């Protein structure tokens, strides 16, 4: 999936955030881990995506 900046912090288990709780909500007991990187090059529109 694709989100903004602060919500990658919001993703972390236990932490609560509107996007986090209303969309993905990783469980408390988690055995796995995430990847993230900047995507401004291929996911930005001058008029707006």
């Amino acid at each position: 999936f694709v989100i903004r900046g602060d919500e990658v912090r919001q993703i972390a288990p236990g932490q609560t955030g509107n996007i986090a709780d209303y969309n993905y909500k990783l469980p408390d007991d988690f055995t796995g881990c995430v990847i993230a990187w900047n995507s401004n090059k291929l996911d930005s529109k001058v008029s707006g995506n």
């Binding site: 912090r9 972390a12 288990p13 236990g14 932490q15």
Partner: protein
């Protein structure tokens, strides 16, 4: 502060004794009686029963 308990920092101190007791220098707290010779007694020289 918002990180999970798993990723919170922890201070670790590791102690390494040397119980080969060659010079003995860091003897712990205790109290020393006199020395008596030519008598079957219970001796405790440097922590040795």
């Amino acid at each position: 502060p918002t990180y999970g308990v798993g990723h919170q920092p922890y201070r670790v101190v590791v102690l390494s004794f040397e119980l080969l007791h060659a010079p003995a220098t860091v003897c712990g707290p205790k109290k020393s009686t006199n020395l008596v010779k030519n008598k079957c007694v219970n001796f405790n020289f440097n922590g040795l029963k």
